[PDB]
Design a protein around this ligand. Structure first.
Ligand SMILES: *[C@H]1O[C@H](CO)[C@@H](O[C@@H]2O[C@H](CO)[C@@H](O[C@@H]3O[C@H](CO[C@H]4O[C@H](CO)[C@@H](O)[C@H](O)[C@@H]4O)[C@@H](O)[C@H](O[C@H]4O[C@H](CO)[C@@H](O)[C@H](O)[C@@H]4O)[C@@H]3O)[C@H](O)[C@H]2NC(C)=O)[C@H](O)[C@H]1NC(C)=O
Ligand SMILES: *[C@H]1O[C@H](CO)[C@@H](O[C@@H]2O[C@H](CO)[C@@H](O[C@@H]3O[C@H](CO[C@H]4O[C@H](CO)[C@@H](O)[C@H](O)[C@@H]4O)[C@@H](O)[C@H](O[C@H]4O[C@H](CO)[C@@H](O)[C@H](O)[C@@H]4O)[C@@H]3O)[C@H](O)[C@H]2NC(C)=O)[C@H](O)[C@H]1NC(C)=O
Ligand SMILES: *[C@H]1O[C@H](CO)[C@@H](O[C@@H]2O[C@H](CO)[C@@H](O[C@@H]3O[C@H](CO[C@H]4O[C@H](CO)[C@@H](O)[C@H](O)[C@@H]4O)[C@@H](O)[C@H](O[C@H]4O[C@H](CO)[C@@H](O)[C@H](O)[C@@H]4O)[C@@H]3O)[C@H](O)[C@H]2NC(C)=O)[C@H](O)[C@H]1NC(C)=O
Ligand SMILES: *[C@H]1O[C@H](CO)[C@@H](O[C@@H]2O[C@H](CO)[C@@H](O[C@@H]3O[C@H](CO[C@H]4O[C@H](CO)[C@@H](O)[C@H](O)[C@@H]4O)[C@@H](O)[C@H](O[C@H]4O[C@H](CO)[C@@H](O)[C@H](O)[C@@H]4O)[C@@H]3O)[C@H](O)[C@H]2NC(C)=O)[C@H](O)[C@H]1NC(C)=O
Ligand SMILES: *[C@@H]1O[C@H](CO[C@H]2O[C@H](C)[C@@H](O)[C@@H](O)[C@@H]2O)[C@@H](O[C@@H]2O[C@H](CO)[C@@H](O)[C@H](O)[C@H]2NC(C)=O)[C@H](O)[C@H]1NC(C)=O
Ligand SMILES: *[C@@H]1O[C@H](CO[C@H]2O[C@H](C)[C@@H](O)[C@@H](O)[C@@H]2O)[C@@H](O[C@@H]2O[C@H](CO)[C@@H](O)[C@H](O)[C@H]2NC(C)=O)[C@H](O)[C@H]1NC(C)=O
Ligand SMILES: *[C@@H]1O[C@H](CO)[C@@H](O[C@@H]2O[C@H](CO)[C@@H](O)[C@H](O)[C@H]2NC(C)=O)[C@H](O)[C@H]1NC(C)=O
Ligand SMILES: *[C@@H]1O[C@H](CO[C@H]2O[C@H](C)[C@@H](O)[C@@H](O)[C@@H]2O)[C@@H](O)[C@H](O)[C@H]1NC(C)=O
Ligand SMILES: *[C@@H]1O[C@H](CO[C@H]2O[C@H](C)[C@@H](O)[C@@H](O)[C@@H]2O)[C@@H](O)[C@H](O)[C@H]1NC(C)=O
Ligand SMILES: *[C@@H]1O[C@H](CO[C@H]2O[C@H](C)[C@@H](O)[C@@H](O)[C@@H]2O)[C@@H](O)[C@H](O)[C@H]1NC(C)=O
Ligand SMILES: *[C@@H]1O[C@H](CO[C@H]2O[C@H](C)[C@@H](O)[C@@H](O)[C@@H]2O)[C@@H](O)[C@H](O)[C@H]1NC(C)=O
Ligand SMILES: *[C@@H]1O[C@H](CO[C@H]2O[C@H](C)[C@@H](O)[C@@H](O)[C@@H]2O)[C@@H](O)[C@H](O)[C@H]1NC(C)=O
Ligand code: NAG
Ligand code: NAG
Ligand code: NAG
Ligand code: NAG
Ligand code: NAG
Ligand code: NAG
Lengths: 13, 262, 13, 263, 13, 258, 13, 257, 13, 264, 13
């Protein structure tokens, strides 16, 4: 499913 | 919302939360087996009405500690100070029937003393005392029909979970009458298999609960007396051995009559 | 299916 | 006659034991703090009169335990050498649950040889009272020392919770017959004839002890005189009670016979 | 110098 | 008193303290080398003087912590024992143009440190977090070869500002003899001379000790704050064994001693 | 030989 | 010569050999303790008379195996074969453990029998080994002690009853017997004349030191000639410094020479 | 002191 | 200065350096054999005139490397060693497949400072073998030709900064041109091997146009050995060159004109 | 003593 990098790029704080 | 999703495996992905699931959770259990300390961590998107909840009990002076923490922000689940003195028993080998005097001081300041009981009227019993934080504490919560008895008290006074084991049969009638049954709509909870019983103690409302069992999507139903709370906090709903659980409570005697179903 | 916290509350010895 | 010798850090060598050393030993202390259990293993040759010996007490349901084991065969302490529930004993004195407020609260000895231990140190001018499980040479029995300044007592017994009861103190020990000189210090000052005087002996401590030893720096000679049980001269572990480095302990029978005398 | 077990017998916390 | 005694390689023993060493200690340093976390632990009997003391500074957003606790009970040693401040002076984060890097102290009693050593004939500068005896306050020593200075305070970021330099500490009125070496070598006579003391360093110091080789008597004479004669951790600035630091109040006394 | 804490105060990097 | 020098704890240095040491050695012991493989490794410069040698015996079907290899170059210490009885391990005593066999793990290995009797702890060991001067019988006795080592190269040849000195026929030879210091133990009238037995047909004196501080200690008795040739036989005496001499004529080991 | 291999031959168990 | 001092077992302490020791060192040897890479790490205070140095050679496509790194800040050698080791060189002389059949076998250097090394020890004849090693490396005073010889021993160390320049025939003492200088040659004690009787004139070869006297020790006791011969001047200048000699506590001396090795 | 690097430089086979 969701990309791991993608997710962090837009979400990781 | 986006959360981390991790099985106890340590297998992890980014999750885009489903509609209705607007919180991420992290559940940790820390426990003692042999002379080893184990840890299980589970993370995911969880449901709207969920909160921080806590549980711990004596095991060998070692304790079993369990924590569930919730938060509403994207990916916010990247994982002797002692307090209220409480009775602890019911662990692998210290039965509540056997060591009701035996304390543990709670390690969070929010947590209260617990007593959780399940009895099957005439399957093994369960009794557990220790520390925990639960929504709608402190108070008494419970359900009984003709076959089952579930109960959960949480309180915030020193050792206040001391006492003999709470039995249903030791509780006064409260003047409420509800219908009782357990099983399928055609077997156990059928119309002529459902009958009135006198509600005891704090359980002064009438409950019907629906859900599923093994080995399929076999619909299941339970009717009995309850605290209103049994319908308000899924952790109390978890007492019923039922998957997609739907719980309803209503105030007036007989109000959980099958024909009044909503 | 069965929540992992619930389980300790109602089953865990 | 050859043993492993290991510091606490797992640093070992093969040793040739000295002349009076025909046993190998292994010492394991298991302690706690923070979450963690900590191990400490020492190994070496050791004198031929030593024996297996152990102590343990409650720390939080986590059990603190010392263990020393002994064997007579070439390199038999090489390597890393649970049933539980045997004799039931009062445990306390642990850091947190102090025997005073640490009430009763039992502990099941995890070995059949273990007895109930009560060990106490009291300064007459910070006190230690520990109860738990353990085994020592000369167990069971009551063991002890006192003078005007110090009190040391070790009791082991082999019945259930036989170490239950009030903090043992010297004044509650009835006076026996004997009387010995009491002193602590150097030969020239503390233990001369200045601070040396007869004291009334209390319980099973009916003999007169003179212990001599050393202190740093300069390997400075130090002395202790008082009342004692005979065992106080019989067991190295009993003399370990004394705060001094090379220990020589003497008993004699009749009152006052530990006057500044002999050797 | 001082005994490990000895020391702990008369002193352990 | 008995303590646990442990070398940093974790070789341990129970030990009876020497006369007048009525405390146990636990010194622990945590630091970062590469992407790896190191820890050094030392336990022993120590002199009844010592107290709890602490030091911290930035290393890469990774910190180097140094902790030392002390206690007076048998084997109390057996375990393993806020304010914003400037922090610079690590091997590759200099105070010279590192003056602005900040750091939240990890203990409530920790204060901000400025410690400086300057020579002219290497120079060390360090700022961070610390808990030392007799803080807050300014401490220091200078003679004609060496400047040592230590500042601690309890207000936010007070250790900020330019590198402290001797030259811009205004002269005191008080004056002291300056020398460095053995007696007859560098702390001879007229080999030792008067200097104008500056700053809080308004007393006269002389300190005797030993540099390697094995035993070689070394001396230092200079201007110092009264502190330099009081606290061993201030005396440590002079790199020497068997230290004896005497301070006199009036100006002049340094050359005809014991 | 020098102090462990002391040495950090005056020499450490 | 330069060798690696390595303590058992893994503390290594490069070592320049002393004058009489033109060899490097590696001693390795592999064993089982409580279901755990253990190892111990020692490297150093060694004396030029030394050689490859080997030892193993059963301990649980697990084995203890010992190796010393040797070589004469700078930093040079940087399949079943012969069948043998093995017993004498920590309680598989040779008396109950007789009949237990072991295939030697090396081609050179022979069947070992080694016995020490005090006339106290009795040691008996059968296993595999490679020692200089094999095959052959080797030993020593006086009035208090009996040391024996027998190596051989046929199948299970180390089988048989425990070797007992009383089963070794008289030699014709006789030698003096003493044990200890030459003031208490090896004096005169304290030293006396005994009947040699078996292949132990020469008289032997051996002086050396004990542990820890040096005391002049000696032994005299009946011996096989090899007792004076090989260090690994002289190791039977447990002596840190060690000098051992044998002669051929009845009575020659008298206190004097 | 007393060498390693020797010791096994005459003393090991 | 304080350094970490560590033995090969990971057993450390904090060390105060002695007076002429304002550097910390780390020495890492990476070796092989049976199949596994063994790492050997040693740390301590060291002398001020020391520097980084390095040696590498093929052992099976697996590489043997020595690495010594030096630094002068407080405890700068703390913390372990994923940290440590461009020019292509001949590598040979490792145990099997030596420099006879191993010439032309190439190794690329890790690290730009590394040069091509050629190191040789030859005995002039209880038989003892020669050593011929080619590979990467860095040494103080590189590049250059360093060496010693007498009637008994030949030691040579050549490092060079060009491609594959350590390639070619095995260096032998006889192929080095006689240079015209004359030195006294001996090995042993000053009363057995190096006394006025065994000491004689040899003719010097190659870039070894200076006379060397080396004194040192053997065991047992502190018995003193001596070596007299021809030598390159750097032989007196670099500790690492003197390590060639089979003695401890080394002191080496060079002099200028022929024959300046009187028996004393 | 003997230097470890020194030793290998002249000796490691
Ligand atoms: C070993 O065994 C015991 C264990 O301590 C010792 O017994 C102590 O002995 C000392 C004397 O050597 C005793 O001290 C004396 O106590 C008197 C009373 O103290 C209390 O009560 C008064 C009221 O009277 C209060 O004011 C006071 O605050 C206390 O609460 C004191 O009056 C004596 O003091 C002094 O008298 C003059 C005054 O003119 C003083 O200026 C002097 O300093 C002088 O000392 C004195 O302090 C102590 O009480 C005893 N303790 C107990 C528990 O009995 C043994 O002495 C010792 N055996 C030896 C060494 O032989
Ligand atoms: C403690 O306090 C300070 C420590 O810093 C010392 O002060 C120094 O004193 C020394 C001499 O005692 C000074 O050195 C002298 O400097 C003179 C001028 O320096 C110039 O030299 C050239 C050209 O002008 C430039 O390179 C340089 O930058 C300066 O401009 C020189 O004239 C002296 O040199 C030489 O003089 C004769 C001439 O024939 C020569 O034969 C010798 O080579 C001699 O060296 C000399 O170098 C030094 O500059 C001072 N430093 C400072 C910062 O002021 C104190 O000495 C000290 N007090 C005590 C006694 O403890
Ligand atoms: C080296 O070689 C051997 C070692 O094995 C030594 O031989 C031993 O010599 C000793 C004494 O020299 C012998 O011991 C003697 O045994 C006699 C018999 O004892 C047994 O039988 C009797 C009944 O006859 C039982 O009572 C007893 O329990 C035994 O089972 C005893 O008679 C002797 O004891 C004592 O006699 C008088 C009685 O009035 C007592 O007062 C004394 O105690 C006296 O000791 C004695 O014990 C022993 O038998 C020999 N061992 C053997 C043959 O196996 C050599 O001595 C030695 N060579 C040297 C040193 O030169
Ligand atoms: C340092 O430099 C070199 C180091 O190698 C030395 O040179 C050697 O010197 C020795 C001794 O002076 C020389 O040995 C002598 O030479 C003759 C060898 O010829 C024989 O060689 C072959 C080998 O293939 C033999 O099989 C065959 O017999 C040859 O004829 C011998 O004739 C001499 O031997 C002896 O003769 C009588 C027999 O009647 C013996 O009893 C004596 O022992 C006598 O020695 C002898 O072996 C050797 O040849 C040189 N080697 C070379 C040049 O390669 C230097 O001497 C040394 N510098 C010093 C010490 O100053
Ligand atoms: C949900 O729980 C988190 C963390 O819960 C731990 O901390 C509480 C106080 C303690 O009782 C433990 O039993 C729990 O395990 C809480 O998050 C806190 O949020 C603040 C920011 O406002 C942070 O500064 C805190 O550090 C953080 N707590 C910690 C120690 O991680 C949170 O309060 C709670 N949600 C609720 C009750 O609303
Ligand atoms: C000492 O032993 C070595 C090798 O080790 C031996 O181990 C046991 C005892 C035996 O069963 C064999 O496995 C080995 O022989 C001898 O040989 C050297 O070791 C290596 C190991 O592979 C081989 O390459 C060679 O055979 C040899 N090395 C070389 C080429 O130089 C060694 O010869 C022996 N020494 C004696 C005393 O004979
Ligand atoms: C506990 O200790 C007692 C001693 O106090 C032991 O009993 C002694 O020894 C024999 C054994 O049969 C008895 O006949 C005596 O009564 C005891 N001696 C005396 C004089 O009191 C007893 O064996 C021990 N039991 C345990 C737990 O091992
Ligand atoms: C906590 O204390 C109050 C309740 O305490 C009781 O809890 C249960 C219901 C009873 O069975 C008794 O045993 C206890 O005494 C709460 O009303 C209140 O919200 C809390 N107050 C505090 C102290 O925070
Ligand atoms: C010395 O101790 C050895 C074993 O030690 C442990 O054995 C069991 C597990 C328990 O009893 C523990 O408490 C002991 O520490 C024995 O095998 C050995 O025999 C002992 N010595 C004697 C003669 O008792
Ligand atoms: C000495 O320190 C003890 C340990 O606890 C402290 O450790 C260091 C000093 C700091 O990081 C503190 O924040 C910790 O609380 C104390 O328990 C003890 O009381 C201290 N002794 C003194 C001087 O009061
Ligand atoms: C000494 O060595 C230090 C690090 O050396 C390693 O990294 C370099 C870049 C590589 O070439 C490897 O061979 C080394 O293992 C340097 O940081 C230090 O500056 C060096 N000293 C010098 C050259 O002055
Ligand atoms: C022995 O070793 C060192 C070597 O110093 C020697 O130097 C030359 C070769 C001789 O002629 C003698 O002057 C010296 O023995 C000594 O520095 C060292 O102190 C000596 N002993 C020790 C402790 O190893
Ligand atoms: C429900 O109560 C009991 C359970 O013990 C059961 O025996 C009975 O059949 C039920 N009661 C009636 C009479 O409906
Ligand atoms: C100091 O202690 C005792 C004094 O009784 C003595 O046996 C020991 O040898 C002395 N230690 C040394 C070597 O100074
Ligand atoms: C055993 O010894 C014999 C006798 O010389 C010899 O032939 C043989 O090599 C040895 N071992 C065997 C059987 O290989
Ligand atoms: C190789 O490089 C060195 C410096 O490392 C320098 O002297 C010169 O450029 C070269 N030397 C030669 C040609 O040997
Ligand atoms: C720092 O300042 C306070 C006032 O805030 C003052 O009482 C004292 O001098 C200092 N206190 C400490 C020790 O932090
Ligand atoms: C004692 O033994 C000998 C003398 O017999 C001597 O050479 C040596 O120095 C001493 N050995 C030890 C280990 O002290």
């Amino acid at each position: 499913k969701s990309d791991a990098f993608x997710x962090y790029l837009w979400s990781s704080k | 919302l986006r959360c981390m999703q991790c099985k106890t495996n340590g297998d992890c992905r980014v999750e885009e939360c489903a509609l209705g699931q607007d919180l991420c959770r992290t559940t940790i259990v820390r426990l003692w087996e042999e002379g080893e300390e184990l840890e299980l961590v589970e993370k995911s998107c969880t449901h709207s009405e969920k909160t921080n909840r806590t549980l711990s009990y004596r095991t060998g002076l070692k304790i079993t500690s369990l924590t569930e923490v919730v938060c509403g922000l994207d990916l916010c689940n990247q994982g002797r100070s002692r307090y209220l003195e409480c009775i602890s028993c019911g662990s692998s080998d210290m039965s509540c029937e056997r060591g009701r005097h035996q304390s543990l001081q709670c390690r969070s300041p929010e947590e209260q003393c617990l007593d959780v009981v399940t009895h099957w009227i005439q399957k093994d019993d369960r009794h557990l005392r220790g520390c925990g934080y639960l929504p709608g504490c402190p108070g008494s919560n419970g359900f009984h029909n003709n076959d089952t008895f579930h109960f959960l008290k949480c309180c915030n006074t020193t050792k206040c979970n001391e006492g003999p084991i709470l039995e249903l049969e030791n509780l006064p009638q409260n003047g409420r009458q509800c219908y009782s049954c357990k099983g399928q709509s055609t077997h156990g909870c059928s119309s002529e298999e459902t009958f009135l019983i006198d509600c005891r103690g704090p359980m002064n409302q009438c409950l019907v609960a629906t859900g599923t069992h093994e080995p399929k999507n076999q619909s299941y139903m339970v009717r009995g007396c309850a605290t209103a709370s049994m319908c308000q906090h899924a952790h109390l709903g978890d007492a019923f051995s039922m998957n997609h659980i739907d719980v309803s409570c209503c105030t007036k005697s007989g109000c959980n009559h099958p024909d009044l179903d909503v």
